Symmetry: D6
Subunit: 170 residues, 12 copies
Amino acid sequence: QLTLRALERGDLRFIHNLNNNRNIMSYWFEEPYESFDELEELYNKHIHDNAERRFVVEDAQKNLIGLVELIEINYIHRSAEFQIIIAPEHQGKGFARTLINRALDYSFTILNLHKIYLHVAVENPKAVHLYEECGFVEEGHLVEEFFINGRYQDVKRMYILQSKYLNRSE
Amino acid sequence: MNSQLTLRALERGDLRFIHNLNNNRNIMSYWFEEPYESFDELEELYNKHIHDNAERRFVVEDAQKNLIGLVELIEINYIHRSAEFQIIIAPEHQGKGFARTLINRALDYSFTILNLHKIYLHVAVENPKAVHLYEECGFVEEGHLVEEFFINGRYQDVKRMYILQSKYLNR
Amino acid sequence: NSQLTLRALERGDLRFIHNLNNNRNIMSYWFEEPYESFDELEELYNKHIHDNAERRFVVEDAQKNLIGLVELIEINYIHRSAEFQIIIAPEHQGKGFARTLINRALDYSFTILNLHKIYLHVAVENPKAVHLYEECGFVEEGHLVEEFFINGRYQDVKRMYILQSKYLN
Amino acid sequence: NSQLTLRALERGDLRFIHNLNNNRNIMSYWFEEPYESFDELEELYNKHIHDNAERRFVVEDAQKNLIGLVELIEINYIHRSAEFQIIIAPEHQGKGFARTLINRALDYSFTILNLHKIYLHVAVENPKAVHLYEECGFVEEGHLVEEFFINGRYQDVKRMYILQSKYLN
Amino acid sequence: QLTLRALERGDLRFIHNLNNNRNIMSYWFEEPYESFDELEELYNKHIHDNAERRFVVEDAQKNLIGLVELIEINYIHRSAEFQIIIAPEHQGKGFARTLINRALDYSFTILNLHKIYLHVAVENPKAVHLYEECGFVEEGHLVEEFFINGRYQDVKRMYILQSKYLNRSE
Amino acid sequence: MNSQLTLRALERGDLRFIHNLNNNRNIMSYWFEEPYESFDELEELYNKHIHDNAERRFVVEDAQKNLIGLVELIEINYIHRSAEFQIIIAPEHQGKGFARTLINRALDYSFTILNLHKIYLHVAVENPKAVHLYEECGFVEEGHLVEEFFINGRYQDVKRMYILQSKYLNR
Amino acid sequence: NSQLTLRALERGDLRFIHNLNNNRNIMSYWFEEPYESFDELEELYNKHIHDNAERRFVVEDAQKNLIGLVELIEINYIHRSAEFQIIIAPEHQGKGFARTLINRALDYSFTILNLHKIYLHVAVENPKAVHLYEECGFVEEGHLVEEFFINGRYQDVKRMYILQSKYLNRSE
Amino acid sequence: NSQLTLRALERGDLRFIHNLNNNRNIMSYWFEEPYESFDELEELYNKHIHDNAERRFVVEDAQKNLIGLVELIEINYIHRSAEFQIIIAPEHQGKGFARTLINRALDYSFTILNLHKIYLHVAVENPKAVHLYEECGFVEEGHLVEEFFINGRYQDVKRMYILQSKYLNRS
Amino acid sequence: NSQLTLRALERGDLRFIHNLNNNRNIMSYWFEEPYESFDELEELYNKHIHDNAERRFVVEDAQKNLIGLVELIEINYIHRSAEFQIIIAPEHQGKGFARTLINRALDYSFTILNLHKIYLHVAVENPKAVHLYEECGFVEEGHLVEEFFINGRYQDVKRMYILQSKYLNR
Amino acid sequence: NSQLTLRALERGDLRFIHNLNNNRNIMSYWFEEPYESFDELEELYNKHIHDNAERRFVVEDAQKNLIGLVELIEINYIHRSAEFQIIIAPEHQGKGFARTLINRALDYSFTILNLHKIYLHVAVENPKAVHLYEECGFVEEGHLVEEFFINGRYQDVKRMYILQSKYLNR
Amino acid sequence: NSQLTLRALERGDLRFIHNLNNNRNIMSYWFEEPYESFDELEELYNKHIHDNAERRFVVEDAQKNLIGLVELIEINYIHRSAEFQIIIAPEHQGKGFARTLINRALDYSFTILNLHKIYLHVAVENPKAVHLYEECGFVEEGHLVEEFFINGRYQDVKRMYILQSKYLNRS
Amino acid sequence: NSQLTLRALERGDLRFIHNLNNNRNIMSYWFEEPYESFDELEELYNKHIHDNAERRFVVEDAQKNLIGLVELIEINYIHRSAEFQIIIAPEHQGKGFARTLINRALDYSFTILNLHKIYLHVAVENPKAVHLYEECGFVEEGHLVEEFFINGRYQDVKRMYILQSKYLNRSE
């Protein structure tokens, strides 16, 4: 039913809408941005660049569901950071697992990465329990990592490995 | 009402409106400390500094999407954690009591998101109602700048007023 | 007269400028670079969009008819002085618009731009123009001998000036 | 089968190429530079428009339906050899079009381009494909051990070849 | 009635048509050209450049009448070469004098040049007699100057001076 | 008739037609000694060498404006006053007897306008009718180039044939 | 003091600039861009050779010892103002030079540049400097609160200013 | 021992940095971009000379001998954080400089650059070093599993941090 | 005095120009762009090397000591005029070189460059130079009020002029 | 023999590479671009300095005489393989250095670079080297027919390979 | 006297060319572009190094003394024409080199460059020189009236030419 | 002759190239662009360092005397052909070198380049050269009429050629 498509220029206005509400400073290849035109200029500059890969998610009706990002990709350590944003009008439909699995399948089969980690705000038990459900395990509890909404907040770092993902059924 | 108003990062399309605002005023207008007068100069300036992060600007519109004004932070220093705030309300929305709501919104962004230590601003000595307004919002005078700006025919004095992050967050 | 407004010049106004510089019988310049054709002028316009040495303002009226041009050149921010010229369209010349125009320019050059002296050149063989600028408050400071080749003959211009303090008081 | 034609690839064909490289489950390249998105591919396409290292040909039929792609890469003008691959659209696979396609490529690579050897890789775990290329006249020359990571598992490809003299005689 | 307008990009297709029939190799700032696109590229390159000035001629109906060119303009010697091309559908209407006079008036008043010369093919008595009519005088008969239509052809060089043009009535 | 045909310097718009011609042929096609296959390659080549004068090309159309063929001079040397001529007629106009008219037109341009001394051309040994054609137009063999060009599967011989300016003008 | 002279800064002078901006421990800036290494600075110098927002002058004595630096930054020719500052090389402080320099800076700014107003900032924790500029005609227009993070804490600084007519016409 | 000093890196220091990143048997990075040869580094140094995400100091002594390098990387001026690394030359290890240098980098980070958190990475397989950092005020916040491929295999590293509020209210 | 030469300026001479413009006590420009440092002036020199608006000539004796600068600016090739300025080294004033200098400049502008008018500004409050120029055939044509800010007060310059024919019919 | 070092290549070393590729008797490339002259190779060197496809290591003894070249090409970071080649100077062959060399390369590619497969071509008609590589753990996986034109005839190369685990479980 | 030789101009020859264009009291041109200072010329030389409309040879002797310059300009490869100029250094005038040099430039023009017409300009006010050229084969084709502004006034020049057909069938 | 070696041309070598293209009095060319001055050539060299349409080799002897030049131009890898020519420095002609060089050029072209056909032009007014190339396996395929303007008149030249299988397999 659900599909993942590599991101392209048409998709930017959708990206841009996503990067509002949850109200961090957003980034594109580590360069920060607030406005469409800013983003568009960043998009055009880093079109060649492989440190980050993005995939829009649409359904069988082409409703734009959410975004799967991979950043900080390193091909020596063979690792990457993953995050995911679902559009508010599509949360609570059970989609997030399917997507995480598709991110992991891509990273661990096509990109051939060794390790995917991610970050979840400690003041968000639900997500933690979700990534836990999907294979992730805590490797860190990072104290005062980010200033969000008025204060420095803690976040869990969580990770999964390739042989685990691919071979844990054998 | 005033929850009804919303901030929104500026966009190429917003330049006409900016230009209209900076006309009424009869000072020179700067964009990243660089002067301009015509829309073309501005568009050329906008594009040059589209990536620069010493200034950030928000368009203020309402629920019916009318264009209300501009919230502007310039001179952002990310070592000393400071910036200068300016606000501009369109003529036909002056005197409807939005200022204090917009001031509060800008303070919010500067302190809860951008994580700055100090916002300061300039007001004309010759406009005490505006000075008594900011004071009411928590601003305090730190300077009377003598003959600082050449405005509409002569040099004018301005109050430099500030507010610190610790005082806002604890309001 | 009160209807007249001033507006920073923009790209769209280049047609109007070009039509105005048609009859002059002299080589019109742009940031001291000569030009005949729109295309020449446009390319120039893009090149000097940020050059502060010159500043231009279009005059339009009630229902936005293009009346004329106000122009400052050789602007110098050390000595605080500019040369000034003004052109009104043929189809609006002789209505009483010149004065108002002159004024609005001075107002700009003295209340906004913070200049000390404004000078201009008028053809000697233009009697009434010289008397006009006198009425607005200019004074001859030079009678410039054989300064400009015009209609196939070197001619005399007067150079005329007015000061910030004399406008404002 | 006789209806099928070959056509140098052009910009307009980039959509067709992109759709074809969707399912592959591997990272498609362009002049050895990887790409996922149309926009990525387009920018690449502009960059290597004159690079001779690779050459591409779109297959279309009677009423210009896009059938598939023929592709030569690592073309070497000293040793006179290219690697070769072919992709047919899902909605035209299994019609008897492969053979014809293979041939037309060889014809090109040997009658026009003046190459000596054509090689290609087929997944070992693809029995019938290997038998196919044998029928057109390819011979294994290598069984390449754990060459490509595919579906999360390093896999074996056979490398298969055919020569100019063997096509032409 | 007749008017001269500085040349611009819209006018190129008209230029291009003119530079066919009379069948020399045509030039733009001394660079040669045969095709529209060639010309257009030359036009865009030498838009700044002042060695040459061109003026389309239109009537009170905006019919494109002909072209007045000035080339080899030198502001030390204060001289230029002039030529003129009328479109075949507008020859024999007595226009050529009016135009030559307008070229001379421009060159000698606005540009303030000292001397305008030109070339006419010796095997064209009519034009010679025309320029003669307009003030020009022969300063040279240049032997085998140009290869035209199969052979090297002679041309008269003819000139007029500024004080002559402007003051010969006083 | 054949006065009815006209030459015309090539233009960006003519590239589609050129591309269509150079398909039939199953040689590689060059544009300023640089190979191409797809329309995009050609457009990119065209624009690069739009100013180069080592080659000149004319489109041949008729009175009803149908596209007839291409007259092409390459390798123009302006010291030795020489060039190579090639001609290409669209399929559906081959065998209507235009060639000799077009050949004569190209010779005309080369010799009465471009002022060249020698036009030479290549013809396939394996096509004697074409060879007996050029001879009839005044061309003469100066060489049998052994295995010169790789064409449609093997190396072929070609006649190099020429004609000089003095012989044309005195025809 | 009779000996002292000013010279517009040039490339040779960069090593000296750099030696000055070390053991004072603000972050330093060229045209509002930060820098710590020589190379960093050099790159910035070249990038900003045209730029008229800031003018710098080296001070040398009659023996051509490099005495100190006079900077003007934030120069605006609409408001006709600028911000001044001065740095003397540690091995030359307490030799009475500072006043003479300040007069020269005010003289250039107000004659040759034809500026209207010159301001500067003094750390509040420097009473002696405050007094100095105060002697030279400068007056307090601001006590800027927690303006700068210097040495592990935020610090107050005085803004001080002098006007052109004051400077030129005070004795008239 | 106080004789030790820190000096903003200069092009001329690159050889020394290269000599340092020989031993390591990791891949070396300059601004998140990998290098091996001095020529790669020098070309990287020039590209990134203005970039502010990283900061490097060469440590020398009274006798101007080259002791070591102090790096800050991944500097973020919103979240006010940065990763720190130190390298001592082989022949200067075990002479008691590390704590002093650790303490100098902490000083710069918190007194001049006005950061809030400094963190670093240390091999799980080097408890000596983990206990060293702990004694200097660092606390463990993570056990990164198989984070870095280093000399033959994937290794775990402790991530340790320390906060500005704590370095300043220090013993 | 008869030995004084004039030589086109070049890069080598910049040090000299720089030293000369040192204590001018008003800002020096170069093609209307202001400068203070040698480095600034050098960049400027390279930028305007083919710019014709201005032309500069170094003066040397038969021993090749650097005597002065002759400088024409605001050169207009339509109206054939220029502004002229001259600077003599502090170590060569009061030797009666000026008029020879003034002359050689006139000579070049009127016999080589084909200009019609030369004009120049002289501080009103420097009456000696005023009379000097009068003595060479310059004549007041303007008393320019408050033209230049100099030494903290706007001052008056005379503008003074001579024609090509008055130079040559003498 | 234990003293042999390996050092990343740099500009200084190009002379050596150039000399080594001299009488190869087939064309030498650089990032897949062919070259003959030092000057050509230098330009090439600057063009691909940050290109990761290929990596090169110079071999020296404890006395720093230039011993050989170790070279990895066609490096793919997804599939984790490279082609390997090695050249020893004519004046250092027949000293038993190859295997030490071969090893150090393997060592780098498998323990630093994180690669999974190394492969290499050896002329069939050079059976000694064939067995040499066999002796270090390489194994035929292809007999490539008429791959390369060498000395006026297309010749056969074996392609031979080893894995990361067979190197390390030894 | 045959000892004299001609040598395609080199950057290093520029000083000498500059020394030559001092005396002249005309404005000097390099590729139809005027110059005065050596710095203008050197910058012009580099711009036009590939341009083929002009050609220059330095004349030296057996003892490698610099004698003179031979220039061909306005070269047209369709009409096969060019203007020629010569300059002899002051201290080498009236020693009988001119005719030899005239004859060497004629030789190059017609035997190597394959031109058809060489013309030149000479002052009407220098009959000595007009008679010199006439003796070398040149014939008058024009009396250009007030053509060049030279040292104070406008001057007439003879335009003289000579054809290739005539230099080759020469005595 | 046993001593002779070939080396791909580099920048140092340009002076030598230039000295060669003087007193032979064709117009000379680099990548089909004309040139007379050293500087001209140098500029062309740099412009065409990538270009593979032409390859040049310097000949040196065991003492490193610069003996001559071997050029290949018009190289095409579809038709696999190229045009060869050779120039020996006047002070080295009649030393028997020419053949050995021609073999080396044919060897590079037909082994390392894997070309199919090598042609050259000889002026018809040079019987001796014709004979030489003829000895080396070249055969006439054209008598190109008035091909080149050389020395004040248009001149005939022979086109000659040899094929790869000939070169390699003739003794087989």
